[PDB]
Design a protein around this ligand. Sequence first.
Ligand SMILES: CC(=O)N[C@H](CCCCNC(=O)CSCCNC(=O)CCNC(=O)[C@H](O)C(C)(C)COP(=O)(O)OP(=O)(O)OC[C@H]1O[C@@H](n2cnc3c(N)ncnc32)[C@H](O)[C@@H]1OP(=O)(O)O)C(N)=O
Length: 319
Amino acid sequence: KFSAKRLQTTRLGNHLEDRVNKFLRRQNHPEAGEVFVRVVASSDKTVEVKPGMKSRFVDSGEMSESFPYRTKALFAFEEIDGVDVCFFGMHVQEYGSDCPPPNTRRVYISYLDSIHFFRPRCLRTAVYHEILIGYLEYVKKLGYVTGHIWACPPSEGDDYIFHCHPPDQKIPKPKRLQEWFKKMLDKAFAERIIHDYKDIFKQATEDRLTSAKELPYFEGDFWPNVLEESIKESSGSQKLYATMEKHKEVFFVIHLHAGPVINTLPPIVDPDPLLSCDLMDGRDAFLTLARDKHWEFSSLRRSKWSTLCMLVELHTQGQ
Ligand SMILES: CC(=O)N[C@H](CCCCNC(=O)CSCCNC(=O)CCNC(=O)[C@H](O)C(C)(C)COP(=O)(O)OP(=O)(O)OC[C@H]1O[C@@H](n2cnc3c(N)ncnc32)[C@H](O)[C@@H]1OP(=O)(O)O)C(N)=O
């Protein structure tokens, strides 16, 4: 059987799944089926400091030439009409306790995407928020300290993870998306999971940032390219602050631990093994496969069959 339930379980996936399904059992809605959360890819990578920042800070010995990270792809499936429907996907980057500064003990959400067929609709957002809260709660427990989110909707007609969204699935503008993250993080705060969250500009000020080399440097994040442009343009710190302030509302810095307890945390050890899966190594592979195979997520029926196809591929990549 090629169900989503039969995809390999992990501590991470199970923690998210248990959180979602406990939330759903506290709601009085008949329609809500059981949710499965599966980590489907997990591999170790490095992000290299791009040439401008490398010449300024790596060649002078002020900044590590690259940063190691674990990246993971996870997906959420709902039983709908007795048949799995993938409705949520997310990629994360995790910079562990051995990672050189400035990235040490930080997580970054590379990408998040969704297809709006969760039943019931009135619980869809709450379920997305619970998946994200669960993720923060989980990496906090392993000893990560700071999480990072860039609230950036896709360009028009573009897809982050799932090929071909429904035509009536509206795409939030950045303001709506910031507010969506604030509501999620406000709930995380109320549950005493996160200590605080701040926009990037306020955080940099309180951190007394004076050099671009102090900014966490993540793969595909906004800031590495900003820094490459400012070096081609040629007080780098004064510009950086002006850019951070200008876009501050869209960059979230989330603190999972605060205060002197940070100084006591043991090494971070991922209890889950790595999972080799070329299909879900980054976003382009699955997007390409679906485009070529005409797997769309644009109606419930097409999402059902595309989920079936995605599941058969994930179960047999290792055959
Ligand atoms: C730039 C660069 O260099 N590089 C970038 C890389 C940047 C880094 C990427 N950053 C991230 O990954 C984290 S930010 C999230 C960005 N990902 C996406 O946005 C994927 C598409 N969006 C979605 O899947 C969902 O909207 C989701 C974000 C999961 C929220 O779903 P939801 O359902 O809980 O809330 P709702 O969507 O607001 O809808 C909730 C209500 O709001 C409605 N609504 C939504 N949008 C609109 C709208 N525009 N106008 C009017 N109403 C609107 C909506 O219809 C609804 O109504 P109802 O509940 O009555 O039906 C690059 N690689 O391109």
